Ligand binder design. Sequence first.
Ligand SMILES: *[C@@H]1O[C@H](CO[C@@H]2O[C@@H](C)[C@@H](O)[C@@H](O)[C@@H]2O)[C@@H](O[C@@H]2O[C@H](CO)[C@@H](O[C@@H]3O[C@H](CO[C@H]4O[C@H](CO)[C@@H](O)[C@H](O)[C@@H]4O[C@@H]4O[C@H](CO)[C@@H](O)[C@H](O)[C@H]4NC(C)=O)[C@@H](O)[C@H](O[C@H]4O[C@H](CO)[C@@H](O)[C@H](O)[C@@H]4O)[C@@H]3O)[C@H](O)[C@H]2NC(C)=O)[C@H](O)[C@H]1NC(C)=O
Lengths: 212, 215
Amino acid sequence: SVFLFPPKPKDTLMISRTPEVTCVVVDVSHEDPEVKFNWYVDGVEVHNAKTKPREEQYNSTYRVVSVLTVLHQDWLNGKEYKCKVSNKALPAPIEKTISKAKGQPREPQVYTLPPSRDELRFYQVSLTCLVKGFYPSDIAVEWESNGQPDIFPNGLNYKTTPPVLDSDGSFFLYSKLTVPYPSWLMGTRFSCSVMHEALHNHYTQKHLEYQW
Amino acid sequence: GGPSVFLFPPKPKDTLMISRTPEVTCVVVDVSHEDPEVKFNWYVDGVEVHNAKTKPREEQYNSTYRVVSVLTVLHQDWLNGKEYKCKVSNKALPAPIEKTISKAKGQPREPQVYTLPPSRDELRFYQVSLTCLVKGFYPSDIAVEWESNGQPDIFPNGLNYKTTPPVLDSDGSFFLYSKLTVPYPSWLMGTRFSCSVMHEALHNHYTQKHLEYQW
Ligand SMILES: *[C@@H]1O[C@H](CO[C@@H]2O[C@@H](C)[C@@H](O)[C@@H](O)[C@@H]2O)[C@@H](O[C@@H]2O[C@H](CO)[C@@H](O[C@@H]3O[C@H](CO[C@H]4O[C@H](CO)[C@@H](O)[C@H](O)[C@@H]4O[C@@H]4O[C@H](CO)[C@@H](O)[C@H](O)[C@H]4NC(C)=O)[C@@H](O)[C@H](O[C@H]4O[C@H](CO)[C@@H](O)[C@H](O)[C@@H]4O)[C@@H]3O)[C@H](O)[C@H]2NC(C)=O)[C@H](O)[C@H]1NC(C)=O
């Protein structure tokens, strides 16, 4: 069986990062550990990929991974990436194809919402980031603060929901940042950072802070 | 070749409302035209039961059948954590397949339900977002709905809302958001919108928080 994976959204949107398609091969036997990979971008073969050391599994199978570095603009422009796997236990090679989702890109709207009055009873309060109206669903969301590091030594404690298909064919998600009520009253500025293909510089940022 | 079994839990709203009929569903896939017969045996805490109902086998677009057996469960039985076991027999299986499902173990935790008005920056648009935060509940089985006192000429097809799936939070509990999209005029109009949350750990398995424009 073959599994072909897309690049990480944040990798395709930042020039400094390295996006890559990942072609995983499973059900590899001990008698047949040979695996060959052929990569094709829009049908044209490319030879920049790199195979990884075969991973022995606890169920007596191997896991063979082949990575291909892609150009950010190639993936965003919708070029197809095809992985071709050859093995003796396979009558013929397996070809999987992956590409970015089709459809006109749509720009996310980012809204920050303070905690409810009813939540201030608790020591931990919830800072909310609403990201709606974007397409495709590939997106990256993070939180930041201008707080000094001992205030958040282990970083910020936030979770983000997966994209949800909205009633108009676009996607939305929420990201929840949990902070102590004192650091909220302290006036610290917290920032929801959203990275998406349709944004200017693939990046936008919305802030949230208390006012005494 | 070989069939595969998948055992699914009841729907959260069905187990939390006494008026509803919750049921465990045992699905069998990759059943071929040859040997389409499938036998089911059900066991609640090991005790065999004969209350199940098999449904007519669905011919699939890949030349396989899909044979479904449903078992009605008692609201109290499921919430108390009884195990439901499905045993599938078919001439294509060297031996039967046994799948077991039950409610998640662990002390149930009560959700906190918070309603959030739209961001000031969203009022540019005719459609605005009313948010319901549901956090700190366990297990993840939950149902969320919205309601309003709005008139039908503004909402002829009902309310337009979507809810995220539960997300595991950093403390082992779950949280989700539910988004209700309404026209900005009906928000300014003073219409009252209500977030309804149904979970085993709530009083009467139900709670409701309101949201309306503040002057
Ligand atoms: C021939 O075609 C069959 C059905 O037709 C296909 O259906 C889908 C899958 C598309 O491919 C269509 O294009 C096509 O027509 C195939 O049957 C499917 O087999 C696969 C396994 O190969 C099953 O995958 C399993 O899916 C579980 C989820 O199942 C729920 O959600 C599905 C949506 O993805 C939905 O289709 C299912 O019907 C089911 O829906 C729930 O039903 C219950 C009761 O009926 C309801 O109470 C719920 O509300 C429903 N919920 C939803 C959301 O609809 C997974 O849970 C399961 O996971 C298991 O394995 C993974 C990894 O292996 C583990 O991570 C995990 O822990 C767990 O162990 C698995 O992914 C799929 O469900 C089957 N579909 C149906 C409809 O039965 C045949 O495989 C195919 N044969 C071939 C190609 O040879």
